[PDB]
Amino acid sequence: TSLVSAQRLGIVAVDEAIPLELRSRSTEEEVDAVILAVYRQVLGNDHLMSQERLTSAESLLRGREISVRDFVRAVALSEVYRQKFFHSNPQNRFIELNYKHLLGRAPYDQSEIAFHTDLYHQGGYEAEINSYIDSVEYTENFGDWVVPYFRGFATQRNQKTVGFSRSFQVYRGYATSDRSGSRSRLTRELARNTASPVYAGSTAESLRGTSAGSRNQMYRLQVIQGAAGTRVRRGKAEYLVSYDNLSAKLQQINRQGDTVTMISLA
Amino acid sequence: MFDVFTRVVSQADARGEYLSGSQLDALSATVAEGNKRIDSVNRITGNASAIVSNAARALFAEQPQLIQPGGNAYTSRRMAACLRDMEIILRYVTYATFTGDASVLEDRCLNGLRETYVALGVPGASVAAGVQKMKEAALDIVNDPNGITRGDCSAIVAEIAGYFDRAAAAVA
Amino acid sequence: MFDVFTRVVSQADARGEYLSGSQLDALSATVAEGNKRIDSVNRITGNASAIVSNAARALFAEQPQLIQPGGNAYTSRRMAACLRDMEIILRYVTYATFTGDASVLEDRCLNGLRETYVALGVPGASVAAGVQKMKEAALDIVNDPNGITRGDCSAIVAEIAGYFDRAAAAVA
Amino acid sequence: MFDVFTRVVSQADARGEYLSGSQLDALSATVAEGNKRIDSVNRITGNASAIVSNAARALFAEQPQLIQPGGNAYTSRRMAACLRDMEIILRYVTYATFTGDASVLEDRCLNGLRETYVALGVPGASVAAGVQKMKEAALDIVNDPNGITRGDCSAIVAEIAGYFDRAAAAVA
Amino acid sequence: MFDVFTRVVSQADARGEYLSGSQLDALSATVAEGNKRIDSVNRITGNASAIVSNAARALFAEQPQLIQPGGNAYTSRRMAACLRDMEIILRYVTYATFTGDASVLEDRCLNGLRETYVALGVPGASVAAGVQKMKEAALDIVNDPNGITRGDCSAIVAEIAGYFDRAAAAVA
Amino acid sequence: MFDVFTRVVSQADARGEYLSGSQLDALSATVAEGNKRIDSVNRITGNASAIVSNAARALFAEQPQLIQPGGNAYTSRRMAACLRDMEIILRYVTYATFTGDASVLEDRCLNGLRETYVALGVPGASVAAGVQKMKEAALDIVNDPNGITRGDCSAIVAEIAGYFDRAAAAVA
Amino acid sequence: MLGQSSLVGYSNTQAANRVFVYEVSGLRQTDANENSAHDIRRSGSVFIKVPYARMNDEMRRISRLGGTIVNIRPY
Amino acid sequence: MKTPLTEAVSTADSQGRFLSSTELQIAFGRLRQANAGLQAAKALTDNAQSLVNGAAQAVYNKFPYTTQTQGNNFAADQRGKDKCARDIGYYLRIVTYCLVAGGTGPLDEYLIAGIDEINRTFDLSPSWYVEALKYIKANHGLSGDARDEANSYLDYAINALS
Amino acid sequence: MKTPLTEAVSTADSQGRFLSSTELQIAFGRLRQANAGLQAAKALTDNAQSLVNGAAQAVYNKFPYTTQTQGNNFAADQRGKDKCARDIGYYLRIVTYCLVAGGTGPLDEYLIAGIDEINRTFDLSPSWYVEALKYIKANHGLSGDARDEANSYLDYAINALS
Ligand SMILES: *[C@@H](C)[C@H]1/C(=C/c2[nH]c(/C=C3N=C(/C=C4\NC(=O)C(CC)=C4C)C(C)=C\3CCC(=O)O)c(CCC(=O)O)c2C)NC(=O)[C@@H]1C
Ligand SMILES: *[C@@H](C)[C@H]1/C(=C/c2[nH]c(/C=C3N=C(/C=C4\NC(=O)C(CC)=C4C)C(C)=C\3CCC(=O)O)c(CCC(=O)O)c2C)NC(=O)[C@@H]1C
Ligand SMILES: *[C@@H](C)[C@H]1/C(=C/c2[nH]c(/C=C3N=C(/C=C4\NC(=O)C(CC)=C4C)C(C)=C\3CCC(=O)O)c(CCC(=O)O)c2C)NC(=O)[C@@H]1C
Ligand SMILES: *[C@@H](C)[C@H]1/C(=C/c2[nH]c(/C=C3N=C(/C=C4\NC(=O)C(CC)=C4C)C(C)=C\3CCC(=O)O)c(CCC(=O)O)c2C)NC(=O)[C@@H]1C
Ligand SMILES: *[C@H](C)[C@H]1/C(=C/c2[nH]c(/C=C3N=C(/C=C4\NC(=O)C(CC)=C4C)C(C)=C\3CCC(=O)O)c(CCC(=O)O)c2C)NC(=O)[C@@H]1C
Ligand SMILES: *[C@H](C)[C@H]1/C(=C/c2[nH]c(/C=C3N=C(/C=C4\NC(=O)C(CC)=C4C)C(C)=C\3CCC(=O)O)c(CCC(=O)O)c2C)NC(=O)[C@@H]1C
Ligand SMILES: *[C@H](C)[C@H]1/C(=C/c2[nH]c(/C=C3N=C(/C=C4\NC(=O)C(CC)=C4C)C(C)=C\3CCC(=O)O)c(CCC(=O)O)c2C)NC(=O)[C@@H]1C
Ligand SMILES: *[C@H](C)[C@H]1/C(=C/c2[nH]c(/C=C3N=C(/C=C4\NC(=O)C(CC)=C4C)C(C)=C\3CCC(=O)O)c(CCC(=O)O)c2C)NC(=O)[C@@H]1C
């Protein structure tokens, strides 16, 4: 997005990112940069140890034996990818990680969760992973030579609006990685076809004045509430409370049977 | 998505019963007015660029702070995004008009748009005002009596206006 | 995931000391229990389709409302997803039995299953009832005395029963 | 919240029929274990302070970075908050033991606790380690065979172990 | 909030260290600057209404679109809100100058102000322009040589400038 | 991101006004400082490995809980990740020095870093302590008068110190 | 001619342990790739190494984009 | 959910373009077909009970072993016969939905997807349902456009099962 | 953080008013005290090691049972002695912070709040820490304003513990 929304949302680096294309007759440093970009984006910005590097796959990429898409596929099918994104993760979290790493976006629909779940159950991890890389979406956006990059913050064709909002649930910042087993943030949002408010970068903070307590910190409590007292006006509720009233607010939410969806510093 | 027929179909399967005579006659009534629905879709489409541009000009005239430097419509990139959002909303309104159901408009366009605009800082009230101007314009083309067979399109006009109301409610 | 051995290893590495003698003898006792562990895994695996189908049949018999139109197991795809869920739960129970540790069952299957079900409207209590049906069906299969070397498999049966209960508790 | 009886009542009421003979017998079996359940609750309650203090000492010994300056348990105010959190988890685990159902622990203690610890910078993994320490001490105290009518309390001990695992899994 | 002394204290406590000789010497240097800091606070406070009023008049004179009908400063309530905002920014700048730390300005005033302004359509750039007007107006008042002991106030002028620029950066 | 020139350019474009004489003169003054800014970047870069290694050694000597088993800098992978974080922070501080603006730190290096450290359980205060060690070493290297043209580099050193402090406050 | 180590999936199907080289020509701008973010760099003979299990996909991909499969050779 | 209108919008939205004359002709084709589809569904609905019982009887006739062999998957008792009649009624009802919808979308969404898993895990022969669908074809008594569209849905189900 | 300046700003901010002469006099009083506080902090810091060791010995002398009775809460072993010296060092360091800050704010935020829950949970006698603070009072060697302000913080800790 433009700068004025980008600084607020903390997506300036994503907006100014340039797609990396491995051209013909590329030099050694270009292949090095392409390999580094693939490792950064497919492995979700983890500190990749040299012992976890795919030496044979990057050799084939260097020697023009395979394309960038094939190297992306080799990294995605690698046991390193399995260990940090599949073997200790629930299936819904795993496929949103696949969507972020391979297509650069958040899941659009619960049917996309229904897909890749049956596909896993019928054809294994390899077929399920190949679905993303062989998809029509991967071909027009990245092709055989462009490193995949995150696209959820920009308006795409055949895109649902929720994708942009849901993007901030899967991209938590430039200095973030997908490293810690964790559950998806999009489960209820995808299942019930909703959208969650975006609280990223500086968007989450709210005015404090003299209303915040001793340590001048407000917390936003997003809860799901029903009538258990006073009339409930909305199913969704947001509560801004100081630190000193955080335990009391939590306990009275608990005794009303209200489900807490999120707590963030505001 | 859902169209006017599949909505009744999905409700009937959940109840696990055949469509009754009344529902079948309601859908027969719906396909009786199918030609007017096609005309309205075609008429909005043929003047989509004029609808978007005239509504944007009116919106920037009534709200000069959008195009004022520092405004959210200032700079070519933001102005281009704004005109694209107007065209996008209009396109999805036509999609909902075509299908006879609002599912395409909600699921693909309207759901998540308020949060997106709040996160972007796009003024939802200004976008809602722009959608009313497109609504006002698009009903004038849809209700234009010149060069079309005479008939009563009040029902389809109300349906189109309802879709535009959903859009305006969603952005704000 | 962890197995019965790596679980002790990870705790020891975090504490930064070698496994004590007692931990080594405990793992050796697990080793002496290994053939019966493999037999139980093989027996549940060999009857897995029968286990899932019979448990599902019994579950739909006492809960006709699952398969009633509008029910959560109605329509072919939902019913197939339901049978898949039974099969998935049974498979990770066998994985947990094989490893001697519940981490694969917890991380891959049970983590997030409850709120997935709650979000989607899949009745977790009914899933728990189905898992309980697979429980005794598989425990009779594991404890079947003919065509196997005799011995006490009560400890293995208790461990497999615990995995099934953990799954039943997680989905509800 | 639900207790062991109201849990199956809630499941039956959704399904709209009476508790079957099997469900009533399972509940009578729960009634037959009630004395042991009251003993386990009583034994943990009588040693709550010992459990909390010993678990905290073991945790800060194994994870010294919690109590060095700049650590999250450093300063008296944060150490007291941490001891209070040990106390709150143990108390709600006993509530779950008393009711025979994990709903009180989930709805009143674990509801939003991981998100709360993330928002505050409290290390959830270290909270889970402390809960695991409380678990081992409490299960030992419940299994102590001195000064009590002897009997097999493995089922209630397994149930209590499950509540502690739920707490440890929710915080981390 | 922090003042100039407790900011250094909090950093030391996080490190678990006594203040070094250089930090105590730096604190002694800012103690020797305390009289000048009090004069700056006194001079801005004693001219606060004039600073706000002249800055606001200049801002609308150079940005007439704010006070034109439909503009964000149009109507007496929004005009009053704008003036109040100016006085609020200036007051927290004096708080920060008094304390010697921007924590009070950042935590109580600036945090979330940009989100509020974006959500309301308050143009942050013109708020930043208005704060910039209060900036040199207050800096010339602090630097007025008449009726005060002569001495170099360059450090305190630079610090107050930083608080003003920090407020301007937050709103824009 | 912005450099020292585009920062005032973006501010001016939001105001929709040309850069005034004072802004242009301030930028010219920044240009006369450019050689020393390039020298500071070059000196930190040429000693980056020594800065990281010495700072890490000092940090682990002061906080030995990090490197003992179970600590967050224990194991080679975790230690190498810690070393990479130190080098990455130093690299982005050089970027900020080179550009004259802090936006590269907020946009990239500190964008979600605190969230990352809380999620993984990395002690942020220890990271802030490590950043301070790199701060004192890098400022000493920049201020070394041997083998360079003599001059006053206090302003660039103060700016570099601000970048280091902002990184430390981002994680503390 | 290398590649089979990484192109063939880690599944040990004997059928899947077969890769083939596709020669494609005339990769034009068509209505199928109007919204392609990347641009076509070569329209002459390009060589794509395809494992057996993806030959169904790739030829479809080639056929939507106007490419002419002129030859297919065992690796 | 494959219907002419939803697919026209799906295609247009996938190309990010407004509905042109191509989509208008799609809607025109849906309009020409809709009345025949609606009369087809009504005729099947009014004749649903005789069609379902006759289809069940035809399957029992062609596969007599279904009525004396004991087993959960067979109809030798009343419970199996009830399940058989219910399944054929599901087939008949979802076909009427396709006639209402104008495409195989109801069949794809509600019946076709996962039917292979179901017939295998509960060892139901798809040949039973093929004969049931064949009986409905031979005895629905539709003519013209209604018959053609209804037979296409019934043949779509048959080809899915075979 | 209870400091003259932060509290002055806080009171003014709740009334929403600018800093008047009252807040300026608070700042003037803070300035009058601050240099003495800074030298008090420097003297305590330079003598910190002997003060902490001497305070620990005074507690061990007054309560000999702490060095000879087994238990986690006592200092009969090296682990307990290290914890004790660390606690007294914590006390001394936060007292220097108070002298720097000009108020009991560091003691309140870092040490005083929750200390009674600590001493109860870990069966630590507050009398031990009172004796340590009394030793520090008697041995810091400060005079004048430095002594008065430092004794105020040390007596504040003593009164909290008793
Ligand atoms: C309200 C929407 C306006 C209106 C509409 C209206 N149209 C018709 C009739 C027809 N219009 C069409 C449409 C098309 N034929 C084409 O080939 C194309 C391009 C693909 C289009 C858009 C058709 C086929 C008909 C039927 C034949 C005819 O020419 O009349 C009617 C008459 C009733 C009907 O439903 O057919 C009406 C009412 N008329 C108005 O007064 C409104 C301004
Ligand atoms: C596992 C938990 C341990 C265990 C328990 C156990 N307890 C009983 C029996 C009883 N205990 C009580 C308890 C109480 N009486 C009181 O007045 C109070 C205070 C309110 C308490 C806590 C009672 C009433 C009984 C029944 C009479 C009796 O004294 O025996 C049993 C016996 C079986 C039963 O269910 O009655 C058992 C097994 N025994 C062990 O070995 C574990 C270490
Ligand atoms: C830059 C800020 C200007 C400046 C300041 C300056 N002030 C002093 C000295 C004093 N100022 C005061 C202030 C007050 N006394 C009061 O009773 C009140 C009301 C509560 C106030 C605000 C005091 C007490 C002093 C010291 C005694 C004296 O009056 O001289 C100095 C002198 C050096 C010093 O810091 O003590 C300076 C430099 N001088 C300028 O030229 C700037 C325009
Ligand atoms: C504070 C930063 C220290 C300092 C710096 C300083 N440097 C110069 C002058 C120059 N430095 C350079 C730099 C380079 N030339 C190269 O080719 C390379 C490698 C690409 C570098 C880094 C240049 C070009 C100059 C100008 C020529 C000259 O040598 O004078 C100055 C002098 C003032 C100026 O701005 O030129 C200063 C002050 N000096 C100190 O004492 C600090 C330790
Ligand atoms: C070292 C001083 C301390 C420490 C560090 C530590 N960090 C991690 C893990 C990560 N560090 C980062 C940070 C970045 N990655 C980037 O790309 C950027 C530039 C924008 C930054 C700032 C991230 C994202 C991670 C996540 C994991 C990853 O592998 O990338 C670890 C590893 C933790 C673990 O392995 O579980 C560690 C150890 N730890 C200490 O104890 C020191 C105080
Ligand atoms: C114009 C009337 C108003 C306006 C608009 C504006 N919008 C954006 C940015 C985006 N718009 C969307 C919306 C969609 N994307 C889709 O794919 C769909 C269809 C399903 C929709 C509805 C999104 C997601 C964005 C952000 C991503 C992108 O820009 O591509 C902007 C730009 C904001 C910025 O800072 O760049 C603008 C300006 N702004 C006004 O002031 C008008 C009132
Ligand atoms: C059958 C006994 C009950 C039932 C099941 C049912 N489940 C779903 C949907 C999902 N189930 C899961 C769970 C998993 N998928 C995995 O891949 C893993 C293993 C790693 C697990 C644990 C998920 C993620 C879903 C959602 C995605 C999907 O649709 O497949 C459904 C479908 C719900 C819907 O269509 O909305 C059903 C029907 N339903 C019952 O009524 C039984 C009690
Ligand atoms: C101790 C094992 C670890 C630890 C703990 C720690 N927690 C907090 C702060 C809070 N803890 C809670 C949790 C609850 N409050 C309740 O009322 C209940 C029942 C619903 C629970 C479970 C809350 C809400 C807070 C914040 C508000 C409050 O304290 O009242 C802290 C303090 C953090 C801070 O002061 O900033 C600490 C230290 N820290 C560790 O390092 C241990 C692993």
Ligand SMILES: *[C@H](C)[C@H]1/C(=C/c2[nH]c(/C=C3N=C(/C=C4\NC(=O)C(CC)=C4C)C(C)=C\3CCC(=O)O)c(CCC(=O)O)c2C)NC(=O)[C@@H]1C
């Ligand atoms: C004046 C230079 C510009 C301007 C201002 C303006 N602000 C508002 C509304 C609000 N301002 C605040 C800010 C604060 N409230 C506080 O308590 C504090 C301290 C923590 C601050 C900084 C808030 C919260 C509001 C909203 C609530 C309220 O109206 O009081 C308005 C009114 C907007 C509206 O539509 O009502 C205005 C006009 N507007 C300009 O055009 C100037 C450039």
Ligand SMILES: *[C@H](C)[C@H]1/C(=C/c2[nH]c(/C=C3N=C(/C=C4\NC(=O)C(CC)=C4C)C(C)=C\3CCC(=O)O)c(CCC(=O)O)c2C)NC(=O)[C@@H]1C
């Ligand atoms: C009748 C042609 C033959 C027959 C039938 C029979 N069917 C079942 C069981 C099931 N039938 C279905 C089918 C569907 N469920 C749906 O939701 C839909 C889509 C809307 C369809 C087509 C399913 C899923 C089952 C299993 C679950 C259930 O019992 O409902 C049985 C019983 C099998 C069992 O093990 O209980 C039988 C007997 N039997 C014959 O002999 C006929 C030739």
Ligand SMILES: *[C@H](C)[C@H]1/C(=C/c2[nH]c(/C=C3N=C(/C=C4\NC(=O)C(CC)=C4C)C(C)=C\3CCC(=O)O)c(CCC(=O)O)c2C)NC(=O)[C@@H]1C
């Ligand atoms: C020394 C005077 C006597 C003594 C000391 C002793 N203390 C502990 C344990 C703890 N001390 C504290 C105190 C603090 N922690 C803080 O962060 C601060 C504020 C900055 C204070 C004052 C705490 C929290 C503990 C418990 C946790 C920890 O170990 O840090 C012990 C050990 C008790 C135990 O059970 O482990 C001891 C021995 N013992 C004597 O005999 C002296 C007379």
